[PDB]
Amino acid sequence: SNVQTGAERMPHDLSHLGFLAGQIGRLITISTTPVIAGDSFEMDAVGALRLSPLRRGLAIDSTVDIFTFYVPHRHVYGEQWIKFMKDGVNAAPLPTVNTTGYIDHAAFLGTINPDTNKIPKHLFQGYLNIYNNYFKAPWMPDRTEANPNQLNEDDARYGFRCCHLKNIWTAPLPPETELSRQMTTSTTSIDIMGLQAAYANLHTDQERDYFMQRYRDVISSFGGKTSYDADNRPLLVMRSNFWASGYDVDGTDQTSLGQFSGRVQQTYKHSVPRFFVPEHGTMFTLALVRFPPTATKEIQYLNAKGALTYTDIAGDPALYGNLPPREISMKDVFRSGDASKKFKIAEGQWYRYAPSYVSPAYHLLEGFPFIQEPPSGDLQERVLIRHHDYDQCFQSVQLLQWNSQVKFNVTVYRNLPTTRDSIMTS
């Protein structure tokens, strides 16, 4: 009888809808699709972004980010792949991972939880690779769970916490920078040629602390290049950003005459141009919603430290360009800050940055997404976003803090037989 060995190249629809929801400052998966080696991928996403109804009207916009990444299966399975592909049919099946038994767990991966509490390993591990290479601070430790059921709630139902927009206290120098370095000398002598060699060792250490925490950064400084296969990192295909706006509604009865309520609704588009898929893998699409980091109790540095010295106030170029970094506390920038929490800044940074001012009359007032109290804990706890800081800004609904409805217009050019060829023997 007739045996088919090849196919022709045709476009495939693969379009679907998007009823999404999430929290603020957490990275959640929006869409996912498998691809084959040799394909071409295209996507237009058109939708609307809404926030929960506000308590008093629109005051500050929020910014929204959409990302698309490509993750090969060889980056996840490694050597179990390759052997799988070389053996062809009759190869051993690929492994899975375990999840907690609920419906809303494994929702940060953009799927409903199966009744068996098992999902493909490449879905979970492909999310960890994106977070560890692009979204955590380079000086933080990596995250390695091996099983989605080892996470807690708010990590399984919603994504992982991300970082605030850069600021004086949300973007400090890494907690490993050295404020001094010693050189061993004799009792009544010093080698001045070895002193010259001690400055060259410190220069390489300071570069590896401010710019070059990752291997791909070290190679780039020499003038070289690394492919994402050499580093085993995902490939960023597209990125979009916008601000979300809306309007107000006026109350008209006896009690609410003079009261307003804000309604955020924004139309957006995420477009990915044609992309050649070199190996089997997955495409991820993710979203992130954030606010500018405004706090009600922040003060200017020169107004908070006690007595002004020449180094603070003069702005002398010979002094700012030759001094080590300065270590300060949370008490120097916040009214109720803790004096035992320290971080390091650059000298003269108070003449390069200006903070926002919030009047004392705004303290503890509903609506108005601010940070009411100075953040507590170690450095990593302060830099990451706490979505409980925005609970008093919205009204309680079932759809969390933001929701979206989107149509994904995907198109892939594959080499597959038609449905007719698959069901007919001859």
Partner: protein, 37 residues
């Protein structure tokens, strides 16, 4: 990072979603034994 850094805001109103699929049609997908409306 690599290659995107684009933008996506549009003006107007968020019209309701119309049709679950369809941007460009390929070949037939479903065979029931005749026409079905």
């Amino acid at each position: 990072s690599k290659g995107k850094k684009r933008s996506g805001a549009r003006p107007g109103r968020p019209q309701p979603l119309r049709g679950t699929k369809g941007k460009r049609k390929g070949a037939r997908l479903w065979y029931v034994g005749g026409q079905q409306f």
